[model samples]
Target chain A: DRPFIFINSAMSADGKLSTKERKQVKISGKLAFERMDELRAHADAIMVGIGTVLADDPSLTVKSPERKAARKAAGKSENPVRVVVDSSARTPLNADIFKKGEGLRIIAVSNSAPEEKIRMLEEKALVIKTGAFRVDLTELAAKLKEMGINSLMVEGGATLNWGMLSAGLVDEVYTFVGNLIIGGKTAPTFTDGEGFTENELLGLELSSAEKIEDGILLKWKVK
Target chain B: DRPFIFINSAMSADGKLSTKERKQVKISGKLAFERMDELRAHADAIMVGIGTVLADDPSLTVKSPERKAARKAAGKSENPVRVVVDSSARTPLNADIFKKGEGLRIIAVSNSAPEEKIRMLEEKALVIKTGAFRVDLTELAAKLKEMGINSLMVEGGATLNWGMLSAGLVDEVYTFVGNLIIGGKTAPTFTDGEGFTENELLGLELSSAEKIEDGILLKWKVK
Candidate 1:
């Protein structure tokens, strides 16, 4: 059994990750961020990909001190492990993931990445080799399970979302669909990688749908 | 003042109306359709574009007989006037809009539409010349107001949605954001065609948001 993996994202009504510029766009309002913080306090680890890490420079940690205290009081880790999947070791060493000692950083790389860069990453964070040219999520899940991670939350850009979901490593999807629509022919969407074939399409069952003030928070069990 | 013009659409979480092929795809569940049927019974007129008519071939009337009966009991029309903005008079005479005689039909065409085609449409429906090359929505709204339509609901393809909304003719937007995501860069969103520039964008305030059984219905009051 691997970690109970869940994914979360906030997308524009038109499926765009951002406007046509592909810049980092804000889709979640305060309520949605609080929801994310709560989810963060519950997970054993939170993961992203090199593309996301480079673009957004997210802290990848729960920020609320109250939630951290609550986690400690409940005998859980105050912060979840910060995991980054960089198949080619493209993430800068000075990235946000390596900035603070608050959370344990785990960098997963593929066998094809440069050995020197892998060596450099190993100096600060735990580095794991998973696949030949990309991080094998199936094997990574097993490893995470071996490391006593019972739950993991995967926050994504389109490519990483497709990677994890297509690999069958995701158990649930939690998304906050924003209110605004930004229409463009080349806008980024929730999942932008090679889409599934008709027979290979992923199905989901809606578990709960709540109307937030600005958008809808939908939880679905991946089927 | 013109009638309170509003729009209703069902879009994926990523804001896609359908995939790139533009073929009719079902994103709404049964509950959403019921909500739409009720809304259809309330409006004085319901509008769509030639694109939507040709693609979906919707009857554009209240499907529930109980709702139709309720309208009749309330001294309202059994069904709303079926309005189609066919700029070039492209809607076929044998289309579903013409198949039923229960709802009054109004075909708004452009001035440039061929007289032969205009004559053909006028035999079965009231054809109005609104604009030179397109059925001008700004003037159309005033004409609709002159017709004593207190409320009009626009159900759309991307083109018509963009047209009315960007033209500042829409006063409210009611949308159901489905749990699913259909991701294609070229996929049609609720708003298509020429989009609003950033400064001229339509601003909306959340009027009400409710979680239905299938998805969330978000009502935005145009500002």
Candidate 2:
């Protein structure tokens, strides 16, 4: 069995994750940030795509010191395992996830990734190779479960969110709808990939809807 | 003074209103439909952009006979005034909004619109001319207010949603997020046009959040 996987993201009211230039914006307010930090603390691992790493360079670390200390006292790492699904092994060595985080790192790549780049990445993170052309999300999920990751949280830049959901590996989704409108024809949304047809769309059940800060938080279970 | 303008739309959980092909899909369920009809019954006018008229050809009519009768009982038309924002007068005369609705129709067109098309449209609906290369939503809003239209609900195809919001004309927004993912990089979202800069982003205040059918309805007041 795979880990209980979920996606947690903050998007503009119009559903854009970032500007059209693929740059990240401060979408949610402090309350939502606290909620996100709680979500991170609850998860066994945190995952992202190379797109997010390139665009945001997020450290993927638990924000609250109390939460980190609680995890340590429970015989766990200071932070959850940080994962990056980079098919081409393109995660830069200087990415904040590598330099600033005190946790195990995983960079899931494809066999087609350059050997030189993989070697360089291996120096900083455990590079798991699976698919031939892309990092197979299903295989990665299983591997994460085998590594004792009972709960996984996905922080995405669109493409990886689509990959995980389309692979039938996601169990739940949490979205914080911010108050701003970042309208663009080409902006990254919560999910962006090949796109499901009308009949092939994934359905979800609303689990919780709460007003948080100047926005709303929505939780859905895969159905 | 401008009319009290609001946009009401149903979008995929990912924020897409339609497929990458610009084709409409059924996103909301029965309860949301009932709510939309109620909104239509409550509004004085319903508006859409040419992109929506061309793609969906929505009649923009109230679905319930009771609602229609209620409007008529109040000495109002059987349907709310149907309006279209067409910069080039490109809305087809045979569109469903023109054929199936018993209401006053207004087509807001730019001065640069072709005369022949305008004349043809004038034969079917009252055409209001404004702007030069594109229909100025601000001027059109003023004109709609002048015509005694107090409340306007926008049914969008992305571009016009941006037109209204970016022009600082929208008063509120209602979005029903359905339980489906239609992920496409090129798909039309709830708001799409020339995107605003980071500092120029429009802000909103969450007013209401409700779970209806297999979706959640969110309302926001423009700030």
Candidate 3:
């Protein structure tokens, strides 16, 4: 029910996104990163889970000057809407996500949100209520689409990426795999959540693959 | 002292070569497989562990008609020498590897091999004695160099990959990572073995990358 969703992630050749733990080593290099700026510019709204916001403190904005100029020409915002999927309006009030005015800030939350906490965050974000005990992702996507989002990009912290794809919410996937192998059975890979069962493996058809300077850029169509 | 040892493997985007219990699935498609054939044709010897040979029963010979014709024109055998790292000399005497006339088979075993066992197997393969108790990978590589082998390609069952690599026997590396993910906490990633210690992480410099038909083909220069 969401707008066309695409996922962009970077991982080591061994498929690790983070080290065995956080404060992780960077994987995607300059080539993959410049490509990322273009993707953020193309989408209508870019989102992350509250955990990602708390952990990485990402500013989901269109950073390229070219894209900003094109956006203005198209009569769109200089950057896409910044969305956070929070279960109880528990997102940190002082997060970088709230400090940004370059883009619109939205907090998708559950109706079970505490009244005072909701009021507290409402000062910084347009709190979107999508469920009672959890943020119903389908409803959230529909809500974003209704709010005029034609395309969505899910930049992730693992669980949310799996959630978006598992619900059949994603249309495409892109990953820039680095040329290193970080070995650990516990290390995180691209799609990390409860993980798929054997035959329940998600299907994707390779759409295109190309060699960037430092790594490989791979694209897939969700099947 | 080997020519230039490179390993060729294919894996899922998550770095897994097969399912947690694939009995082992095919990771690379036609494009990668064809590439594999060319690599085998070019290497003076293609090697694997006894576990891999017993598990997959691979012929490890160059199978392309072009390669065969090229070898014949060059006055060389149509297939490269096939080697197995087996400390115990337990390789099956009746395996298809013995039945094929296209290649020479060499069993590299530790000096600790029972005389009777080595004598019995001498009928089918030229057994190269390396270290005692366990096959000394370094000694084996040096032995290969002394035997006039100019290059080696290692296909694997994981442990031998790590063993050879950790001993600094590998000079280059290649892996074709498919656009799919198979996730399980227990699933093996690319270098599957008792993982490297923090300081023991192998270093590789990105050499080249390309888009294969179904996945990304990545190459690295061992540093």
Best by lDDT: 2
Q: Give per-residue CA lDDT, model 3, range A46-133, as digits (tens).
A: 8888877776787777777889889878988888888999888878888877676476889998988888898898887788898779
- Estimate the TM-score for candidate 3: 0.76
For candidate 2, write residues A1-223 as lDDT tens digits.
Answer: 6999999999999999998888788888888988899889989999999988888888999989999999999999989999999999999989999888588999999989999999998888899999999999999999999999999999876989999988999999999999989998888899888888766778888899899888999888988
How far in Å is the alpha carbon of B176 misplaced in model 3?
Answer: 3.0
After superposition, the stretches of candidate 1 with alpha carbons farther than 4 Å from their true spots are A12-16, A66-78, A86-88, A107-135, A177-179, A191-203, A209-216, B20-29, B69-78, B87-89, B108-120, B129-135, B179-181, B192-203
Candidate 2, residues B135-211, lDDT tens digits: the string is 99899999999999999999877999999999999999999999888888888899999888777888899999988
The DockQ scores of all candidates, in the order shown, are 0.25, 0.77, 0.30
Cα lDDT of model 3 by residue, B4-80, tens digit:
79988887765666666644665667878889999988888988888777777878878798997897788777888
User: Using TM-score as the measure, what is the rank order of every candidate, best first?
Assistant: 2, 1, 3
Interface CA RMSD, all predictions: 3.1, 1.0, 2.8
Q: Model 2 residue B54 lDDT?
A: 85
**Model 1 lDDT tens row, B116-217:** 998998888898898989899889889989999989999977888888877778888887867665555566777777554433444556677777765677
**Candidate with better lDDT, 2 vs 3:** 2
Q: Pick the candidate with the highest TM-score.
A: 2
Each prediction's Cα RMSD? 3.8, 1.3, 4.7
| Candidate 1 residue lDDT tens string, A1-223 | 6899998888655455665555666677888899999999989999998888887788887889999999888877678898998899888889977885376789999999999998998888899899999899899989999999999998877778878877888899887867665555555667766655323545666787777877777788887
Q: Is candidate 1 or candidate 2 better by TM-score?
A: 2
Against the native chain B, each candidate's TM-score is 0.96, 0.98, 0.93
